[PDB]
Every structure is written in structure tokens, then in C-alpha cells.
Amino acid sequence: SKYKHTVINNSVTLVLGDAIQIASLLPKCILVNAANRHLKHGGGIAGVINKASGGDVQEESDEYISNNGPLHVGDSVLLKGHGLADAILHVVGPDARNNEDAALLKRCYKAFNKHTIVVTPLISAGIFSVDPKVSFEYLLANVTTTTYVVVNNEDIYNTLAT
Numbered sequence: 818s819k820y821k822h823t824v825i826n827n828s829v830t831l832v833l834g835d836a837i838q839i840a841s842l843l844p845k846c847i848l849v850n851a852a853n854r855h856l857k858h859g860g861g862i863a864g865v866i867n868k869a870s871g872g873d874v875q876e877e878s879d880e881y882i883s884n885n886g887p888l889h890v891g892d893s894v895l896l897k898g899h900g901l902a903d904a905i906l907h908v909v910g911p912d913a914r915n916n917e918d919a920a921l922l923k924r925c926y927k928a929f930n931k932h933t934i935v936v937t938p939l940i941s942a943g944i945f946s947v948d949p950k951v952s953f954e955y956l957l958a959n960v961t962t963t964t965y966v967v968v969n970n971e972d973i974y975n976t977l978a979t
């Protein structure tokens with residue numbers, strides 16, 4: 818009630834706000850990180866998540882990658898929550914700057930469905946340069962679990978809330 822939000826369907830609610838704030842307010846959830854293949858959390862929401870954890874997320878990510886190697890585009894890994902959420906699902910969206918196809922978002926978003934409540938940004942809609950409407954369409958097509966999709970730009974919110 819205390820956020821600008823639009824319920825899209827039985828599963829998906831679009832929220833104008835801060836994903837970390839929204840994950841904090843929910844008693845139980847997974848928070849999704851829009852990550853890169855090497856889980857190097859230098860910027861974007863990955864940066865905000867890592868900094869909110871005081872670097873704990875990067876420490877854990879480094880251990881995962883150091884031992885297990887880089888992820889493939891479209892893959893995800895469930896890691897610890899570091900007090901931000903019950904767990905963080907690191908999802909590697911396609912980077913359009915590197916000619917990676919938006920259709921790989923299908924794989925990203927299908928990974929949500931085994932989790933009861935998910936708080937997510939729009940995957941690949943930041944520097945990975947996928948149209949927010951396209952990302953959101955892939956989300957709605959593939960996500961069947963209770964999901965709060967959080968955007969921090971009112972203009973993008975308004976466009977998607979149509």
C-alpha cells in the first residue's frame with residue numbers, strides 16, 4: 818500500500834522503488850541479482866547489492882567462481898542472502914552489447930519458478946541494453962511464481978504499467 822505498484826496478473830506485481838528495500842519488507846523471499854558470467858559485482862544492481870552486504874556477497878561470489886569457473890549466459894546460482902533476503906539468486910542475463918540474444922532471458926526467468934516469493938530487477942534492462950519492455954514481456958511469459966518486479970525509474974514504470 819505504501820508503494821506505487823501495479824498488479825499485472827496472479828503472479829507478477831510491478832513496483833516503483835528499491836529492490837533491496839522491498840526484499841527487506843518481506844518476511845521470506847529470494848532476491849535476484851542481475852549478474853555477469855564471472856559474478857564480478859562492480860556496478861549496476863550487483864554493485865548496490867554487494868555494497869548493501871558490505872562486500873560479503875563479492876567474497877562469496879569469488880569463492881564460487883574461483884572453485885567452479887564462470888557461468889554461462891542464461892545460467893543462475895543460488896547463494897547466501899547476507900541479511901538482504903533468505904538467499905540471493907544470481908542470474909546471468911544476455912548482454913546485447915556482446916551480441917547475446919534476449920531470448921536467453923527465458924532461461925533466466927524460468928529459474929524463478931521453484932521459489933515461493935521472488936524480488937527481482939528487470940534482467941538485462943540496465944547496461945546489458947535489452948529494451949525494458951522486452952525484458953518485462955519475457956518475465957510475464959515465463960514467471961509463474963509470486964514475483965515483485967522492481968524498477969527505480971518512474972518513466973519506465975509508467976510504460977510497463979500500461
Ligand SMILES: Nc1ncnc2c1ncn2[C@@H]1O[C@H](COP(=O)(O)OP(=O)(O)O[C@H]2O[C@H](CO)[C@@H](O)[C@H](O)[C@H]2O)[C@@H](O)[C@H]1O
Pocket residue numbers: 834835836837851852853857858859860861862863864865910937938939940941942943944945946967968969
Ligand atoms: N532496486 C533497484 N536498485 C537498483 N537498480 C535496480 C533496482 N531494481 C531494478 N534495478 C535495475 O536492474 C537492472 C539490471 O540490469 P542488467 O542485467 O543489465 O545489469 P548487469 O547485468 O549489466 O550488471 C552487470 O553489469 C556489468 C556486467 O559486466 C557489471 O559491471 C556488473 O557488475 C554486473 O552486475 C538495472 O537497470 C538496475 O537499475
